[PDB]
């Protein structure tokens, strides 16, 4: 009765939530954007995943 999102879309949500290095503010931005338009699932995911990989020093 909740989450009118496809598997990929909901996966994007969770995967962006699974970004511990990503600023929670940016996380909220991507998540909210996913809520606004989940059509950008694969690619808000591609590039939250990729600020998460790219604020990552080594």
Breaks (C-N over 2.5 A) in the chain follow: none
Please give the distance of CA 39 from its chain centroid, rounded to a whole number.
12
CA torsion, points 38, 47, 49, 39, in degrees to nearest 10? 10
Query: Residue 44, Cβ neighbours under 10 Å: how many?
Result: 24
Say if CB 8 and CB 42 are below 8 A apart.
yes
Query: Rounded to 10 degrees, what is the CA torsion of 35, 33, 17, 21?
Result: -170
Q: Is 19 helix (H, G, I), strand (E, B) or coil?
A: coil
8 A C-beta contact, residue 47 and residue 19: no
Closest by CA to 21, choosing from 45, 57, 52, 58, is 52
């Amino acid at each position: 009765a909740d989450n009118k999102f496809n598997k990929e879309q909901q996966n994007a949500f969770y995967e962006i939530l699974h970004l511990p290095n990503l600023n929670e503010e940016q996380r909220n931005a991507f998540i909210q954007s996913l809520k606004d338009d989940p059509s950008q699932s694969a690619n808000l995911l591609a590039e939250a995943k990729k600020l998460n990989d790219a604020q990552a020093p080594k």
